[PDB]
Amino acid sequence: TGRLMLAVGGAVLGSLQFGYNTGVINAPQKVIEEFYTQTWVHRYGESILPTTLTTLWSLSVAIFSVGGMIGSFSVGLFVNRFGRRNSMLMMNLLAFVSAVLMGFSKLGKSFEMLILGRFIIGVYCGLTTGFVPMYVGEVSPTALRGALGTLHQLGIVVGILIAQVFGLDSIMGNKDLWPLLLSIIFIPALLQCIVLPFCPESPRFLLINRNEENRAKSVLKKLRGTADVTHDLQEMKEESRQMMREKKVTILELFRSPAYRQPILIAVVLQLSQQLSGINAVFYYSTSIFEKAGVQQPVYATIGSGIVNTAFTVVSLFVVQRAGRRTLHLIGLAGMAGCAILMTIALALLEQLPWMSYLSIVAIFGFVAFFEVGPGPIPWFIVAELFSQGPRPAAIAVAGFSNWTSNFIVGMCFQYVEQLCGPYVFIIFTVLLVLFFIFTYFKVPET
C-alpha cells in the first residue's frame, strides 16, 4: 500500500473533475446570462427574450447530460480496447478541448462554444464514471477495495463543493473572471495528464484482456510493496472464472427476456427515483432558488448545501454498511419529500413571513442531507445485487442510461416548470418522491 496511493489518487482526480463541472454552473448563472443577453443584442440587433434566455441557458447546463450518456455508453469500448489508464490519460484531450471552448467563449462572443464545451466535458464526464471505479477496483487489494471505491464518490461531492466555493462573486463568479472559472479544469487535468504515465496499467487488464501473464505479474510487486500475491493472482483467475463462466448478456437481451424484464424494471425506476427526486435542481440552481426565496447572499447557502452534502456523503458510508438497502432508500426518500414540503412552505409564506428565507435553507440542507443517505447510493447498490456476474454489466448501462436521462429532464425542464408553476415546484418533486416511495414499498425487495 505504498506506490498504490499514487495510482489511486491520480485516477480520482477525474472524479474531482466530475465533481466540479457538475456543480459549477449553479453559482454564477446570472453572470453568464448577462453574457448571454449582451451577446444576443450585439449579434442580432435585438434583445433577448426571457424564456429564450431560459431554454438557452437551460441547454447550457442540460446538454451536459446528453454528453454524459454517450460518455457512459462509450465507456466499455475504450476500457477493454485500451486499458483503463491509457484511457483516463488520452481522454484528457476531451477535458482540454472543452476547457478551451468555454474559457475562450469570452472573446469568442459565442455561447455556442459554451454549450459545445459543455457537451464535450459532458462526454468526458460520462466516460469517467466508468473508467475510474474500475481502475481503482482492480488495482486495490480486495480487502481495501471497499473503503477505496469510497474515493470516486467523495471525489465527486468534494469536486462539487469546490465548484461552489470557486463560484463566489469574490473568486471567479463575476463579470470578468467566469471564463477562468469554467476553464480552471485544465489545472486538475494537466496534473493527471502528468501523474498518469507514472501509473501502472491494470493487472486484471494485462492478464485477462491483454493476456500478458508475465507483464501483469510484474505490476503488483510494485503495486504491492511487501505482498507478492498468489492470492491476488488466483482471485484474478477466479474473477475470470465467475465473470466469465456466466455469459455476459447484452442490454438487448435484458429487454427481450421476461426473466429479466422485472428485475430491470426495478433497477431502472430506482434511477428515475434518484434524478426525478429533484436534486440537481438544488445543485444546478441552488443560488437562483435561494435568491427567489429570500436568502441574502445565496451562494453561501449554496456552499452551505455544499458542505452539508459532503458531510452526509461521509455519514452515509457508515450508515450504509449498517442498515438495510431499502431501509435507507425509504427514510431517505421520506425526509426528502417532507423537506420539499418545508421548501414549498417557505417559498409560499416568504411574502407574509420574511424569515422563511431561512426555512428555505433548512429545507434544502436536510433535503440534500436526507438525499445522500437514501436515493444517493442505494439505487446503484441494488443493481449489483439484482444481477449476477453475467447480466450485471448490461444492467448497469441501462441504469446509467436512466440516470443520464432523468437528469437531462430535470436540468432542461426545471426552469420551464419554475416559471409556469411558481413556489410549488417542490410539490411536483413531492408527488414523485411519494410515488417512488410507494413503488419501492411494494415492488423492490431487500438485498
Ligand X SMILES: CCCCCCCCCO[C@@H]1O[C@H](CO)[C@@H](O)[C@H](O)[C@H]1O
* Min CB(91)–ligand X separation in Å: 20
Shortest separation between residue 289's beta carbon and ligand X, angstroms: 15
Q: Interface residues with ligand X (CB under 6 A)? A: 22, 153, 156-157, 279-280, 283, 309, 376-377, 380-381
> Grid coordinates in use for 417?
416548470
SS3 of 40-89: the string is: HHHHHCCCCCHHHHHHHHHHHHHHHHHHHHHHHHCHHHHHHHHCCHHHHH
CA distances from 55 to 33, 42, 58, 118 (A): 11, 20, 5, 15
For residue 241, which amino acid is it?
Answer: R
Closest residue to bound ligand X by CB: 376
Going by the annotation, the residues of the binding site for cytochalasin B are 129, 274, 380, 403
If we measure between CA atoms, which residue out of 382, 307, 301, 280 comes closest to residue 346?
301
State the nearest-atom distance from the C-beta of 219 to ligand X, in Å.
25
Give the residue with the Cβ less far from ligand X, 37 or 286: 286
Rg over alpha carbons for the chain, rounded to the nearest Å, is 22
Give the nearer residue to ligand X in terms of CB position, either 102 or 163.
163
**Residue 296 burial (CB count, 10 A):** 10
Q: How far is the CB of 160 from ligand X (least distance, A)?
A: 6
Based on CB atoms, which residue is closest to ligand X, 7 or 157? Answer: 157
Closest CA to 11 of 186, 149, 110, 144: 149
Nearer residue to ligand X within complex by CB, 19 or 83: 19
Say which residues have a Cβ less than 8 Å from residue 77's Cβ, sequence separation at least 6: none
The nearest distance, CB 320 to ligand X, in angstroms, is 8
Q: For residue 329, what is its C-alpha cell?
A: 432508500
Shortest reach from residue 301's CB to ligand X, in Å: 16
SS3 at position 403? helix
Nearest-angstrom CA–CA distance, 19 and 149: 15
Least distance from ligand X to the Cβ atom of residue 387, Å: 14
Burial pattern 276-285, b for ≥16 Cβ within 10 A else e, equals bbbbbbbbbb
Would you say 127 or 219 has its CB closer to ligand X? 127
CA distance 44 to 38: 10
Residue 105 or 277 with smaller CB distance to ligand X: 277
Nearer to ligand X, 58 or 153 (CB): 153
Phi, psi angles (nearest 5°) of residue 74: -90, -5
State whether residue 187 is helix, strand or coil. helix
Comparing CB distances to ligand X, the nearer of 176 and 446 is: 446
Helix axes 29-44, 50-73, angle to 10 degrees: 110
Binding region for D-glucose: 274-275, 280, 309, 372
DSSP per-residue codes, 141-181: -STTHHHHHHHHHHHHHHHHHHHHHTTSTTTT-STTTHHHH
Q: Residues annotated as binding site? A: 129, 274-275, 280, 309, 372, 380, 403
For residue 137, count other CB atoms closer than 10 A to its CB: 17
CB nearer to ligand X: pick between 300 and 312: 312
Q: Are 283 and 160 in contact (CB under 8 A)?
A: yes
Q: CB of 61: closest distance to ligand X in angstroms?
A: 12
- Residue at grid coordinates 409556469: 420
Q: How far is the CB of 364 from ligand X (least distance, A)?
A: 13
Q: What is the total residue count of the chain?
A: 447
Question: In the complex, what is the shortest distance from the CB of residue 129 to ligand X, in angstroms, rounded to a whole number?
Answer: 9
Nearer Cβ to ligand X (92/280)? 280
